[PDB]
Structure 1
Amino acid sequence: AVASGSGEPREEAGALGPAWDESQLRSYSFPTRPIPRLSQSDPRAEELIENEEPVVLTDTNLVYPALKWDLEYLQENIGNGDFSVYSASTHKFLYYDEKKMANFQNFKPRSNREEMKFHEFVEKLQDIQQRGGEERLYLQQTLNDTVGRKIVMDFLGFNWNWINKQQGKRGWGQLTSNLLLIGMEGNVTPAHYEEQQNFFAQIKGYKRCILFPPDQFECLYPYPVHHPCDRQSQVDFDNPDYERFPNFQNVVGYETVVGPGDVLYIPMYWWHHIESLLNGGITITVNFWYKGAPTPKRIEYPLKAHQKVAIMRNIEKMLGEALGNPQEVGPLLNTMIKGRYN
């Protein structure tokens, strides 16, 4: 009733049937309520972004020229740069930071990155489907100046007017990157948060986005900051370990399904889990990552959740540096608390 989740699937224009159905959504242990789906012109929408709460905007025209993109058009135009393509034999593409792996010798990534040309990505993808294989690929590459000219012309056709006014109104920093994500149906990016703001622009296919506010930190159990999986949840949403992660029993999400033309504001520090709909075919998304506003030169109380998260990260970072080794951070913290604060 109020945990209505994604709502009843919207009907595509010209009576082309429901855009997707409930059977295409994985099933999880926690409840969810809908993210509001609004017009760009709607004051409530503006109110939501202003308060750093998520909103799906349905008519921004942010990536209007990308709406025609598909593998053929992109193979033809995207140029000959290298693309990072992740490979796995599980649906879950857990993000990991390769620069942090030296310190965590026992971290064994379930997904592998292969650099390859776009045409190779399409071939590899084609091979899989034809031999009916089980491996999965997820291409995740920042857009850069090696892309061909039509892609340049597409990008330039994005609604910069609208998004630059957002960046200005919110006091955000610079646009840092636009990630192009191309995924196979049923792919999942497990829950994590970002230390930038994100307008997440869906282009092809459908993605279910499950978000949790920064105040659910205690229910989602991020990896240690020096771990490769910093910012990512330790919890396996498909098999939650309630003994290690008791407060995942209290977690409550905000969810939506985005399709072509939709843009989801994912506010900085908000947890998000992203899945490409089962049997939905391939998905394409391009994101827009902005540095957040500078923090006030002085802090007002009561502190917000995301400011406590920032504090916790800085304590872990400083401890890692002062102790000279990140693996001592935990023993020190435990000594700090046991019998004194727990």
Structure 2
Amino acid sequence: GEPREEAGALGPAWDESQLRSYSFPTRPIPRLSQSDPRAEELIENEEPVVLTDTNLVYPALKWDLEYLQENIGNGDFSVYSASTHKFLYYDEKKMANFQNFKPRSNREEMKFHEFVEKLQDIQQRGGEERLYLQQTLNDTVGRKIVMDFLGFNWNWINKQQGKRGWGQLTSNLLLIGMEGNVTPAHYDEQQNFFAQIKGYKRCILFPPDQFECLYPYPVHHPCDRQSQVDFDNPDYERFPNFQNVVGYETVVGPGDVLYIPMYWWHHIESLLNGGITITVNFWYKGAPTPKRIEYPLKAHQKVAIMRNIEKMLGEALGNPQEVGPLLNTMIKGRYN
């Protein structure tokens, strides 16, 4: 809501002009201490919460481009490129299903200084071209970064994994972005802790029961799990229920950790004119489904049922492009 004040009378951390304007209402995600019972209650009920004092990535709070470039080593890093502010990721494996899909984002491997220089050059000419670096925190990075990575609050996050009954830590991703970068609305099938390090990022989350308002791509499409709605220019004729969507909103800064529950939609943007952003994400496999299914189902279980129906139909028909026509055949004049 109202912008927080940096310690030491350093002024507001951000102002309203750094947030993009959208067509839907939002309400705040709770900001709570990790020792607060309400925070544990929210995570257990699969609702989002911002924890302000986990110290989850404390040793990484000194990370910037200068520190990382000298200590991360001389390895190759995956840099994603976009022509606009919207980063449009896609699944290359599913490109065969949609021969007319034209990719808008592009990946490239380079050294860290190549990433820094291409970053600085774009800011110099102001070319509106934006970049996103993604890298796994393992032993392939330099020694000093490994020391920092080992210094994460593994005690806290291991206990969270234990208490919630989650599966194994799937991925631990370092994310470095440019001001204005937007990852459009999408949902994931894993639990996530979103650990902010440098700069500020506005996170807008939508519950799984907003499926009907957000219109995800077909499961076999390369943009599977992403919303088809252009938040900047929504097509109300194709997507009429986008007029009904309501989100949960928060701005996370250094030291904050946001819990993004599995199947929850999230739209993440780096604040305009806010400098670079650095985030470390942790993803965990969800807990195994309880063997005594309790009716009526939760929204996220209906999402999984719909995903499976689309998958099985694509295999049974021998061609995922026939999924749509058959589903319409099933419905028209029978269920609508």
Deviations 1:157-202 (A, max 9, x none): 0000000000000000000101111110000000000000000000
Distance 1:147 1:215 in 2: 40
- Is structure 2 residue 293 aligned with structure 1 residue 299? yes
State TM-score, norm by structure 1: 0.97
Residue 102 of structure 1 aligns to a residue whose secondary structure is helix
2:261 to 261, 267, 276: 267
* Identical counterparts, % of pairs: 100
Query: How far apart are 1:117 and its partner, in Å?
Result: 1.6
Q: Offset of 1:207 from its aligned partner?
A: 0.1
CA contact (8 A) 1:225 1:231 kept: yes
- Residues 36 and 55, structure 1, Cα contact 8 Å, conserved in 2: yes
Q: Deviations over 1:68-126 (max 9, x none)?
A: 00011111111233211111111000221111112211111221111112111111111
Asked if residue 334 in structure 1 is aligned to residue 335 in structure 2, the reply is: no
1:52 and 1:271 map into 2 onto residues whose CA distance is 13
C-alpha distance in structure 2 between counterparts of 1:80 and 1:307, whole Å: 44
The separation in 1 between residues aligned to 2:125 and 2:27, in whole angstroms, is: 40
How far did 1:308 drift?
Answer: 0.1
Query: By how many angstroms is 1:250 displaced?
Result: 0.2
Deviation readout 1:212-263 (Å, 9 max, x if unpaired): 0000000000000010111000000000000100000000000000000000
- The alpha carbon displacement at 1:337 in A equals 0.7
TM-score (norm 2): 0.98
Q: Is the 8 A contact 1:95 1:232 kept in 2?
A: no
What CA RMSD, in Å, does the superposition of the two structures yield over aligned residues?
0.9
For 2:327 and 2:109, the matched residues in 1 are separated by: 39
CA distance in 2, matches of 1:30, 1:235: 12
The answer to whether the 8 Å contact 2:78/2:134 transfers is yes
Write the distance in 1 (CA, Å) between the matches of 2:123 and 2:233: 28
Runs (4+) of structure 1 exceeding 6 A deviation are none
Give, in whole Å, the separation in 1 of the partners of 2:30 and 2:134: 27
Structure 2 SS opposite 1:189: strand
Unmatched 5+ stretches in structure 2: none
Match of 2:180 in 1: 186
**2:188, 2:332 → 1: CA distance?**
31
Contact 2:43 2:49 in 1 (8 A): yes
Structure 2 Cα separation of the partners of residues 185 and 273 of structure 1? 15
Matches within 5 A, 1:117-156: 117-156=111-150
Following the alignment from structure 2 to structure 1, what is the Cα–Cα distance between the partners of residues 135 and 321? 31
Could you report, residue by residue, the CA deviation over 1:13-49 in whole angstroms, capped at 9, with x for unpaired residues? Answer: 1110000001100000000000000001101001100
Residue segments in structure 1 that go unaligned for 5+ positions in a row: 1-6
Deviation, 1:329, is 0.8
Other structure's SS at 1:178 match: strand
Per-residue CA deviations over 1:277-320 (Å, capped at 9, x if unaligned) read 00000000000000000011231101000000000000011011
Where 1:126 maps in the other structure, the secondary structure is helix
Alpha carbons 1:225, 1:316 under 8 Å: kept: yes
Matches within 5 A, 1:56-75: 56-75=50-69
Secondary structure (helix, strand or coil) at the match of 2:205 reads strand
For the Cα contact (< 8 Å) 1:190–1:273, is it kept in 2? yes
Say which is worse superposed, 85-94 or 61-70, in terms of deviation: 85-94
Q: How many positions carry a matched residue from both structures?
A: 336
Checking the alignment, whether the CA contact within 8 Å between 2:198 and 2:277 is kept in structure 1 is yes
